Design an enzyme around this catalytic site. Structure first.
Site, PDB file in Angstrom:
ATOM      1  CD  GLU A  35      -7.647   9.209  -6.541  1.00 14.30           C
ATOM      2  OE1 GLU A  35      -7.207   9.945  -5.675  1.00 14.30           O
ATOM      3  OE2 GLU A  35      -7.796   7.948  -6.397  1.00 14.30           O
ATOM      4  CG  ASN A  46       0.043   9.924   0.341  1.00 15.83           C
ATOM      5  OD1 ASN A  46      -1.125  10.311   0.566  1.00 15.83           O
ATOM      6  ND2 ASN A  46       0.549   9.669  -0.853  1.00 15.83           N
ATOM      7  CG  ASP A  49       3.768   6.020   1.612  1.00 13.06           C
ATOM      8  OD1 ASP A  49       3.450   7.185   1.435  1.00 13.06           O
ATOM      9  OD2 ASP A  49       3.623   5.204   0.670  1.00 13.06           O
ATOM     10  CB  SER A  51       4.585   8.095  -1.517  1.00 16.25           C
ATOM     11  OG  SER A  51       3.215   7.924  -1.152  1.00 16.25           O
ATOM     12  CG  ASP A  53      -1.269  10.177  -3.926  1.00 17.57           C
ATOM     13  OD1 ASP A  53      -0.574   9.214  -4.230  1.00 17.57           O
ATOM     14  OD2 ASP A  53      -1.986  10.318  -2.918  1.00 17.57           O
ATOM     15  CG  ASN A  60       2.028   6.924  -4.359  1.00 14.04           C
ATOM     16  OD1 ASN A  60       3.016   6.199  -4.217  1.00 14.04           O
ATOM     17  ND2 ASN A  60       1.548   7.742  -3.448  1.00 14.04           N
TER      18      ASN A  60
END
Length: 130
Positions: A35, A46, A49, A51, A53, A60
């Site tokens: 990750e 992202n 959408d 959002s 991380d 998220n």
């Protein structure tokens, strides 16, 4: 902070991640590795959408932490996303534990499915004394 592999392993063990909700330490190690590369300041936007991380486990903002700018979000872990960018991973571990309490468990992270599931993950903890 960018953790060294065994330093992280020992840190996670102390924080009670080994076997948390049936997930071995080596799985958590595999997850952090893919990750963020063990980097607590990692952030990934992202565009798709709106959002983001955050942190070592790339948690998220649509569901787990609040960053204010994500549309239709919840903050299931009840934390500011800022908490997931600290060098001290205590809050990030508490958030990761909250994510796996949902039915999906560790599968909640697609990177886990792609890179860790049904693989020999002992490599991540070998020689760490954990």
């Amino acid at each position: 902070k960018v953790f060294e592999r065994c330093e992280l392993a020992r840190t996670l063990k102390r924080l009670g991640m080994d076997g948390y909700r049936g997930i071995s330490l080596a799985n958590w190690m595999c997850l952090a590795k893919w990750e963020s590369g063990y980097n607590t300041r990692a952030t990934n936007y992202n565009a798709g959408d709106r959002s983001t991380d955050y942190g070592i486990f790339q948690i998220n903002s649509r569901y787990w932490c609040n960053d204010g700018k994500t549309p239709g979000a919840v903050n299931a872990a009840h934390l500011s996303c800022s908490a997931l960018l600290q060098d001290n991973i205590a809050d990030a571990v508490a958030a990761a534990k909250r994510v796996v309490r949902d039915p999906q468990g560790i599968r909640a992270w697609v990177a886990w499915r792609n890179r860790c599931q049904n693989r020999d993950v002992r490599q991540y903890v070998q020689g760490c004394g954990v």
